[PDB]
């Protein structure tokens, strides 16, 4: 999937790799600040911070920062520190998401006129990449087909008709280099708003971007150890990175995103599609604020892979108790080729290894599954429930796929006449 990168990451790559006749100014002149920053050391490494006034803003995938009072413009270093005092380390709500402001960028202030602000954006579609230009930045648009080039003469012809004459050469060179950069590093979205061009050259004041993360095997030399931050309002978790590393090692698909680590509703569902449908059903029945995770396993993972996946979830759901106990939804479609016996054996092994914690946390488990060898899979689920004393309600192809959600949440009775079928 396409994944957002930080403004710092995108600017680092651009400054490293773009090819232009344009003199890009202020290359690599940014300083990153967090609540743990050693400011003496920051200033040792970035003495240019004293050389002119500054701009400071969070770099956490927050859109429209200026409208939110989150861009401090034309400040001395002292002014930046005063501006950060009520913001750095503080919880903030942006839109409907709430998170901590904990990663900021400081850059030189670039004096310029409104007429020197431009807008450039490139983004991907089925039919090619659209390139957008506007002379009121801070709008001409051209489709570049899949096999087409974008030369400076093409940009002048198709995009720069309203641009000041004395800036067409430098804009056309920059946009041409930007597009080659976008292609070579497998971007899917790249917006510079504003791009500033003064008498002194080109300034990249803002950058937002997404790259196609599946292209790591192609681009890793140039990307380096690239980071893909979570959306504002979410944290990154070690368990997520562990599952992501498992996902990278084979053709099987193993995905985990934590929504609410303290939620009492946990899922362990096979398949991209089924995992979404179960999540939909949980939220339709009022469970959104208790839904702890989104994730899936699929593509015929081994017993061991599934054990390692499951144990991660069982560990996560036995960290702190909930008054009303917790629910684990082990669901899926009728699989095409995942071995239900092998995968459910791995889950059963995890359940056995965590039976102590699972009983202490009052977990109830609901299972619905079909596919290759599902009858043996359902049997071993029933069996581990019997041997551990954990309550497990086990259903097969004769139960509607999402019926166990209503059962688990109390909206419908548990039909024992359907067990194991």
């Amino acid at each position: 999937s396409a994944k957002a990168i930080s403004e710092q990451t995108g600017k680092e790559l651009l400054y490293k790799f773009i090819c232009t006749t344009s003199a890009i100014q202020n290359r690599f002149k940014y300083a990153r600040v967090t609540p743990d920053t050693d400011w003496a050391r920051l200033l040792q490494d970035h003495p240019w911070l004293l050389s002119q006034n500054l701009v400071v803003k969070p770099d956490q995938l927050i859109k429209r920062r200026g409208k939110l009072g989150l861009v401090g413009v034309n400040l001395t270093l002292d002014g930046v520190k005063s501006w950060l005092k009520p913001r750095l380390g503080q919880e903030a709500t942006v839109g409907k998401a709430t998170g901590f402001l904990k990663n900021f960028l400081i850059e030189p202030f670039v004096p310029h006129s409104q007429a020197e602000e431009f807008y450039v954006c490139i983004y991907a579609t089925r039919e090619g990449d659209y390139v957008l230009f506007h002379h009121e930045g801070g709008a001409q648009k051209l489709l570049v087909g899949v096999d087409e080039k974008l030369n400076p003469e093409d940009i002048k012809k198709h995009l720069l008709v309203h641009a000041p004459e004395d800036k067409k050469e430098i804009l056309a060179s920059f946009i041409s280099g930007l597009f080659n950069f976008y292609e070579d590093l497998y971007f899917t979205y790249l917006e510079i708003n504003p791009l500033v061009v003064t008498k002194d050259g080109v300034y990249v004041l803002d950058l937002a971007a997404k790259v196609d993360a599946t292209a790591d095997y192609i681009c890793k030399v140039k990307w380096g150890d690239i980071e893909f931050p979570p959306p504002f309002g979410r944290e990154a978790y070690p368990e997520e990175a562990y599952i992501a590393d498992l996902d990278a090692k084979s053709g099987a698909s193993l995905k985990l995103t934590l929504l609410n680590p303290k939620g009492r509703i946990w899922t362990m569902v096979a398949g991209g599609g089924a995992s979404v449908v179960y999540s939909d059903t949980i939220c339709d029945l009022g469970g959104v604020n208790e839904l702890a995770n989104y994730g899936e396993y699929s593509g015929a993972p081994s017993e061991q892979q599934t054990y390692d996946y499951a144990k991660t979830i069982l560990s996560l759901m036995t960290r702190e108790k909930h008054p009303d106990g917790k629910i684990l939804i082990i669901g899926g479609s009728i699989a095409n080729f995942t071995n239900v016996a092998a995968t459910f054996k791995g889950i059963v092994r995890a359940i056995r290894d965590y039976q102590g914690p699972l009983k202490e946390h009052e977990v109830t488990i609901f299972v619905r599954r079909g596919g290759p060898n599902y009858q043996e899979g359902l049997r071993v689920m029933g069996e581990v429930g019997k041997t551990t004393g954990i309550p497990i309600h086990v259903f097969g192809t004769e139960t509607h796929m999402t019926a166990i959600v209503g059962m688990a949440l109390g909206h419908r009775p548990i039909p024992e006449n359907l067990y194991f079928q």
């Binding site: 999937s1 396409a2 994944k3 409907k96 998401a97 709430t98 991907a124 089925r126 090619g128 899949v146 096999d147 292609e183 497998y186 899917t188 196609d212 599946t214 095997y217 192609i218 979570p230 959306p231 504002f232 309002g233 979410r234 053709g251 698909s253 995905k255 995103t257 929504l259 398949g271 991209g272 599609g273 089924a274 995992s275 979404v276 449908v277 999540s279 939909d280 059903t281 949980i282 939220c283 339709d284 959104v288 839904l291 989104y294 899936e296 699929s298 593509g299 899926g332 479609s333 009728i334 699989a335 095409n336 080729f337 079909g370 596919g371 290759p372 192809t397 509607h400 796929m401 999402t402």
Partner: protein, 324 residues
């Protein structure tokens, strides 16, 4: 729009990869469908030399040739017009491009997940130029009861029998999800006279063939009397169905549900399992698409829970009026 008909009971395929269990599953399906001949004529696998693999046609052991080089397979099997590509994500692009140098191949299934979107756009461009239908990437494939099934689609014989996939009904479907296509096989078999054809277009941002591609095929297929679409959050493909109904192009009843309604209730963006399943604008959410489809005259259940019930109701009306 490309070909209306991709598969028949005479379709012959080459499988790229050492996928003996999937091939044998196809042959088990072929046999209970009463095909004259196996659907897999040859395999291509560059990591071994030329050899023969043993498979079973009913109780009878048969041999299917495995070729190290695609060119040899194509030359020896001119009857083949389908390639099923199990190449890993690293080489799926090159092998699929190579397949399209052979004019005999009119349909390609691409199994692998994790192909960069920019490479898939280049596959799409070459396939559009040549008129080749691509199913995938990142898919299990599809199934045409009585005729042909792609790879692992529909599983082993017990499921083929349970869901009546050995003979066609009147209901065609297209799904964004592999696993959920087999759930649709099950639901449709219990509520109607069964699946006529089903395709899983895969979860990627740019599927080689889209929902509307297949919906149009089904509209143009006389044996199909109603169409089921399992859509998903992300992108705007499903609005094309709204447009086709409005234009009078789509006249057969269409049932559709778009999964991903939960995303509207989250406080931050969540990337789901399918690479394409992320809404970049309000119009890309499942809630918006379900609402638009309902307003355009598509039959839309209140939730996935009621999908079977609305399929059955549409089916029974068509029977009552003599369409089925």
């Amino acid at each position: 729009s490309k070909s209306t008909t991709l598969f028949s009971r005479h379709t012959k395929a080459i499988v790229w990869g050492m996928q003996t269990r999937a091939v044998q599953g196809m042959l088990d399906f072929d046999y209970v469908c009463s095909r004259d001949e196996p659907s897999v004529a040859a395999m291509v696998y560059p990591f071994t030399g030329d050899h023969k693999q043993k498979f079973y046609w009913g109780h009878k052991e048969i041999l299917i040739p495995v070729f190290k080089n695609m060119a040899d397979a194509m030359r020896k099997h001119p009857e083949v017009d389908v390639l099923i590509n199990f190449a890993s994500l690293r080489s799926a692009y090159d092998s699929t491009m190579e397949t399209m140098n052979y004019a005999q191949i009119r349909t390609i299934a691409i199994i692998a997940e994790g192909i960069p979107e920019a490479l898939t756009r280049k596959l799409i461009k070459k396939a559009d130029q040549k008129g080749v239908t691509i199913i995938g990437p990142a898919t299990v494939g599809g199934i045409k009861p009585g005729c042909f099934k792609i790879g692992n689609t529909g599983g082993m014989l017990d499921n083929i029998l349970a869901s009546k996939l050995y003979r066609p009904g009147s209901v065609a479907y297209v799904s964004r999800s592999g696993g959920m296509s087999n759930e649709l096989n099950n639901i449709i078999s219990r509520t109607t006279d069964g699946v006529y054809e089903g395709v899983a277009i895969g979860g990627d941002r740019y599927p080689g063939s889209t929902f509307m591609d297949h919906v149009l095929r089904y509209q143009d297929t006389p044996g199909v009397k109603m169409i089921v679409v399992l859509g998903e959050i992300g992108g705007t493909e499903e609005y094309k169905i709204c447009r086709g109904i409005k234009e009078g192009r789509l006249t057969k009843p269409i049932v559709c549900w778009c999964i991903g309604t939960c995303a509207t209730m989250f406080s931050s963006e969540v990337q789901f399992g399918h690479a394409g399943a992320c809404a970049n604008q309000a119009s890309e959410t499942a809630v918006a698409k379900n609402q638009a489809l309902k307003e355009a005259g598509v039959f839309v259940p209140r939730s996935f829970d009621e999908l079977g019930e609305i399929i059955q109701s549409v089916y029974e009306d068509l029977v009552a009026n003599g369409v089925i």
